[PDB]
Structure 1
Amino acid sequence: PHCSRNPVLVRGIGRYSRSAMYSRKALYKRKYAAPVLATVTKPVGGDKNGGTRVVKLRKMPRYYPTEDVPRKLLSHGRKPFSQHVRKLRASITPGTILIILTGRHRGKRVVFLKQLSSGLLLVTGPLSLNRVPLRRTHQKFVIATSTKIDISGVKIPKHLTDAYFKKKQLRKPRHQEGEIFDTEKEKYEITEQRKVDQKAVDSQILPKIKAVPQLQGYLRSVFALTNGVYPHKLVF
């Protein structure tokens, strides 16, 4: 149950030596003096007449495809998306103000909350101010304006995550022929647990943003480029 003995000096490079790690791990004093045809393998079964049947769990298949592809070469370095490292830009801190650029909420200024467990930024503009729900965004699609409120004394709910922000439509077993199968019903509900979570989060955000003067006006405003204003010229 012991943790890492040497510190991460450079990523991929040990810190002390071979010999100092030898002396710390103590391979000294751990010099250890340590030098079918008849029976069935795995049946699970039983029968009344004829004795007990010898069944075959995970039996042979009934059709083999006439052509098939071979195996691969194990690809040597690949990790799935749930096992990646999660990056953060230096301007995105918990408590900053973001300019959202690509969605239907385009040009809006949002109090940032936290980085989720999927690389997606948690986003909560005040619904009374900017009409923004609990919404995920991405780091590449967002200009991070350097205006940082004090936010560390809040209580975000732990149950909201990437599994909580997930769409649930497009089910299989319908009749699939006619004037049916998801062309109708025209709607999607609000799921009022989302409303209760939005109230419990913006009721903690709002007295910490109405203390700064004109900050609620800056959040109710929308960002837009105009004549004579260029992003390599203005600083944010």
Structure 2
Amino acid sequence: PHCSRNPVLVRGIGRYSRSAMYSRKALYKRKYAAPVLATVTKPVGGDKNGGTRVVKLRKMPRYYPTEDVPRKLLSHGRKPFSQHVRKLRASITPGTILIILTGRHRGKRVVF
């Protein structure tokens, strides 16, 4: 698992080229010339009398609602809050004295 072979000048633009990546990644010399009804799917279990029963994993629902909503289109761009990139103001640096305005400690001075 190598790192990125080319740096980034700006967000979304490669540094050298596509061909310089062909040379840098060494795509040359990296050529890889590479030219039911009988069996149950996934049951597990047995039984004592009569043989071994076949269980069903994730059985069909016992109840169906009268109507349901259709699926969405995934929005193509959404990430969870944990995956978000954290921002920070330049003036906020460790050791800086801060003024808290909204909390019950209103107008108080605090070390960051």
Whether these two folds match at TM > 0.5 is yes
Shorter-chain TM range is over 0.9
Rounded Cα–Cα distance in structure 2 between residues aligned with 1:36 and 1:62 = 26
| TM-score scaled by length of structure 1 | 0.47
1:46 shift after superposition: 0.6
RMSD (Å) for aligned C-alpha atoms: 1.6
Report SS of the residue matched to 2:20: helix
Aligned residues: 112
Rounded Cα–Cα distance in structure 2 between residues aligned with 1:35 and 1:72 = 39
Report SS of the residue matched to 2:110: strand
* 1:107-155: CA deviation from partner (whole Å, max 9, x where unpaired): 00000xxxxxxxxxxxxxxxxxxxxxxxxxxxxxxxxxxxxxxxxxxxx
Rounded Cα–Cα distance in structure 1 between residues aligned with 2:48 and 2:9 = 69
Report SS of the residue matched to 1:82: helix
Unaligned runs of 5+ in 1: 112-235
1:36 shift after superposition: 1.7
1:31 shift after superposition: 1.1
Report SS of the residue matched to 1:60: coil
Report SS of the residue matched to 2:24: helix
Structure with greater contact order relative to length (CA < 8 Å, sep ≥ 6): 1
Query: Could you list the runs of 4 or more consecutive aligned residues of structure 1 that deviate by over 3 angstroms after TM superposition?
Result: none
Rounded Cα–Cα distance in structure 2 between residues aligned with 1:19 and 1:57 = 51
Sequence identity percentage: 100
* 1:155-202: CA deviation from partner (whole Å, max 9, x where unpaired): xxxxxxxxxxxxxxxxxxxxxxxxxxxxxxxxxxxxxxxxxxxxxxxx
1:35 shift after superposition: 1.3
Report SS of the residue matched to 2:86: coil
| TM-score scaled by length of structure 2 | 0.97
Report SS of the residue matched to 2:23: helix
Rounded Cα–Cα distance in structure 1 between residues aligned with 2:66 and 2:91 = 57
